Design a protein around this ligand. Structure first.
Ligand SMILES: CC(=O)SCCNC(=O)CCNC(=O)[C@H](O)C(C)(C)COP(=O)(O)OP(=O)(O)OC[C@H]1O[C@@H](n2cnc3c(N)ncnc32)[C@H](O)[C@@H]1OP(=O)(O)O
Ligand SMILES: CC(=O)SCCNC(=O)CCNC(=O)[C@H](O)C(C)(C)COP(=O)(O)OP(=O)(O)OC[C@H]1O[C@@H](n2cnc3c(N)ncnc32)[C@H](O)[C@@H]1OP(=O)(O)O
Ligand SMILES: [Mg+2]
Lengths: 265, 266
C-alpha cells in the first residue's frame, strides 16, 4: 500500500518548518520568481500534506516573490489525440459537443499533482486563461505572468514561460526529473524542433460555450531528459533534498538557452 | 478498477452533464430539494468533464432555490494516537500535534470524500462549516442556515449540519456508494447514546493563532451503518436507480435517521 510505504521510508515527520528549512538550504530566497514542479510522495510523510508544501513555499518566497505552477487540463482537449487512455471514435463528437468549458477557478488539473491542486484554489492564487495549458501564479508578478496567454502556442513566446524567462526566474524540481520540466518547451518552440498539431478545446466566449480550434506544438517531454543530463555537466544546478525528495534548482534562462542550442544541432 | 482504461471499457457511451441530469430526474431529484450527496466518480463510468460534470448536473437539477450539501471531512487533522490506516510511530505524535496546519475552510483539503466533493467545495457561493474534522459544505437557498454554528464537540450531533437537514426534511443521495458512506446515520448514533465518548484533538485558529484544541466527540462507528442500511431497505422507503453504471439510492434523511435511532435502541 502506497501510504504505508511512504511512512516506512520516513524517519521523522516533514513539517511546514522542516520543508521551509530544506528549501532555504537548497537556496530558495525571499523575492525570487520560481516555477515549481513536484511529487508529494517523493518527499516522504508530511504533516499537513499538500498544504504544508504550499505554505512552506510561500513562507520562503513571500509576497515580494512569485510562485508559478503549471495547471494543465488536458481532459478538455480534442479526443482525436487521446492516448492515455484513448476513447472509441464514436464518442468523439459527443465529447466535443458536451465537455464543459474551461473556467479558471473551477476546472481541475490533470497529471499536475496534489501540490498543484492545493495551490490553484489557495486564496489570492491567479490562473491564466488557457483551456489546456494554463498556469497558476501567486505573489508580486502573479498577474503579469498569467495575463493574455495566446490560444495557439500555449507554451511559447506569449505564455507564462516567456514572462518567467524575461524576469530571469528559477525552476524548482521536487522529487521529479527533467521530463516534468515545462520550461524546456520554450526551447522546443524557439528551435522549432517539434511538430505542430491542430487542437481544440471548449471556452466561454461572449457568455456562451464555444468549441474552439487552434494550433499548438506537440510537446514531447522525453527529449527533455537528455537535455537535462547534458545541462548538468555544463555548470549550475543546485541539488539537495527536501525530506527524501531529490530536488534541483536552476535558472530558467540558463536551461532554456541551453536547450535552444541543443535543438539546433 | 480505477484504471482509466477499465473505466472507459465499462461504458457504452459517454456520460455527460445531459445524461446525468436526465438520470438524476428519473431517480426523483427535483427542483427545490435539499439534498446531501455522497459519491464515487469511478462508479458512474467514463464522464466527459469528470467531477465538473457531476457537480453541474446536480446544480442544474436542484437549482439555487434548492440546497446541495456534501461532507467535507478532513480526518488527517486528527490526533495521530488513533490512526490505523496507517498508524505512524509514537515518537511522531507530539511533533504532529505541534506542527499540523490549522483548519481553514477556504484551504483545508478533504480526505476520502472523493473528487466530486473536492470540485464542489471550490465552487463560488459554496459555504463550508467551521469544524476541523467534520465540516460540511453547502450551496443554494439554505446553505448558510445549514453550515453556521457547527459546535466543536459532538460534531455530528444536534448542533450540526445533519440536524439542520433533518429539520428541513432533506434527502440523501448515494451515487455508487453504500451505507457506510451515509454520514446522516451518525445523527442516529448521537440520539440513541449508542457509542462511547472519546477525547479528540485538532488544530484550529483561535484568537488569531494556531492552537492544538481538545474536545469531546462520539467515536462514530460506520460498520453499524451497513447493518442498519441492509435493514432499512427491507423495511423503509428508498428509491433506487442508475446514473451510468452507478447504483444510486435516494431517501429521506428523517426516515433513515429515525429508523437508525430506533435500531440503536434495539
Ligand atoms: C512538461 C510538462 O508540462 S508535463 C506537466 C508538468 N507536470 C508537473 O509539473 C507535475 C510534476 N509531478 C509529477 O510528474 C509527479 O510524478 C506526479 C504528480 C505525476 C505524481 O506524483 P505523486 O507523488 O505520485 O502524486 P502527487 O504529487 O499528486 O501526490 C499524491 C500522493 O501523495 C501521497 N500522499 C498523500 N498524503 C501524503 C502526505 N501527507 N505526505 C506524503 N505523501 C502523501 C499519496 O500517495 C498520494 O497518492 P494518491 O494519488 O493515491 O492520492
Ligand atoms: C460516515 C461518514 O461520514 S464517511 C464520510 C462520507 N464519505 C463520503 O461521502 C465518501 C463517499 N465516496 C466514497 O466512499 C468513494 O468510495 C471514494 C471517494 C472513497 C472512492 O471512490 P472513487 O470513485 O474511487 O473516487 P473518486 O470519487 O474520488 O474519483 C476518482 C476516480 O475517478 C476516476 N476518473 C477520473 N476521471 C474520470 C472520469 N472522467 N469519469 C469517470 N471516472 C473518472 C479515476 O478512477 C479516479 O481515481 P484515481 O484518483 O485513483 O486515479
Ligand atoms: Mg472557495
Amino acid at each position: 500500500n502506497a501510504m504505508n510505504d511512504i511512512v516506512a521510508s520516513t524517519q521523522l515527520p516533514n513539517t511546514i518548518k522542516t520543508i521551509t528549512n530544506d528549501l532555504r538550504k537548497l537556496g530558495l530566497k525571499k523575492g525570487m520568481t520560481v516555477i515549481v514542479h513536484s511529487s508529494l510522495s517523493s518527499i516522504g510523510w508530511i504533516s499537513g500534506g499538500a498544504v504544508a508544501v504550499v505554505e512552506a513555499l510561500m513562507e520562503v518566497i513571500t509576497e515580494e516573490g512569485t510562485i508559478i505552477m503549471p495547471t494543465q487540463s488536458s481532459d478538455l482537449s480534442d479526443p482525436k489525440h487521446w492516448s492515455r487512455p484513448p476513447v472509441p471514435e464514436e464518442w468523439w463528437q459527443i465529447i466535443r459537443d458536451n465537455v464543459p468549458a474551461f473556467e479558471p477557478h473551477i476546472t481541475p488539473t490533470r497529471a499536475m499533482g496534489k501540490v498543484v491542486e492545493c495551490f490553484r484554489t489557495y486564496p489570492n492564487v491567479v490562473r491564466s486563461n488557457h483551456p489546456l495549458g494554463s498556469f497558476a501564479a501567486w505573489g508580486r508578478h502573479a498577474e503579469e505572468i498569467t495575463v493574455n496567454q495566446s490560444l495557439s502556442m500555449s507554451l511559447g513566446e506569449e505564455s507564462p514561460l516567456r514572462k518567467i524567462y524575461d524576469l530571469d526566474g528559477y525552476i524548482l524540481l521536487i522529487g521529479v526529473g527533467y521530463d516534468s520540466n515545462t520550461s524546456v518547451a520554450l526551447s522546443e518552440v524557439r528551435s522549432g524542433a517539434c511538430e505542430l498539431i491542430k487542437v481544440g478545446a471548449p471556452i466561454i466566449e461572449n457568455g456562451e460555450r464555444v468549441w474552439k480550434e487552434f494550433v499548438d506544438m506537440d510537446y514531447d517531454s522525453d527529449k527533455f531528459v537528455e537535455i537535462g543530463v547534458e545541462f548538468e555537466q555544463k555548470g549550475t544546478v543546485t541539488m539537495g533534498k527536501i525530506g527524501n525528495a531529490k530536488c534541483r534548482l536552476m535558472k530558467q534562462r540558463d536551461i532554456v538557452d541551453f536547450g535552444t542550442e541543443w535543438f539546433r544541432k
